[PDB]
Amino acid sequence: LEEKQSASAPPLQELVDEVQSLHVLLSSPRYEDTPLAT
């Protein structure tokens, strides 16, 4: 592995990314155990 590796060697996008990530964290059933303050 060593030998082979040495031989080989406010934007709208981010805003909508935050929107999608927050919606996922809110509506996901895996995160249903999130504390109420969070």
| Shortest spacing between CB 36 and other proteins, in angstroms | 5
How far apart, in whole angstroms, are the C-alpha atoms of residue 35 and residue 33?
6
| Shortest spacing between CB 10 and other proteins, in angstroms | 14
Residues engaged in binding other proteins (CB under 8 A): 2-4, 6-7, 9, 12-13, 16-17, 32-33, 35-37
- Whose Cβ is closer to other proteins: residue 10's or residue 13's? 13
Distance of CA 18 to the CA centre of its chain: 9
How far apart, in whole angstroms, are the C-alpha atoms of residue 5 and residue 34?
42
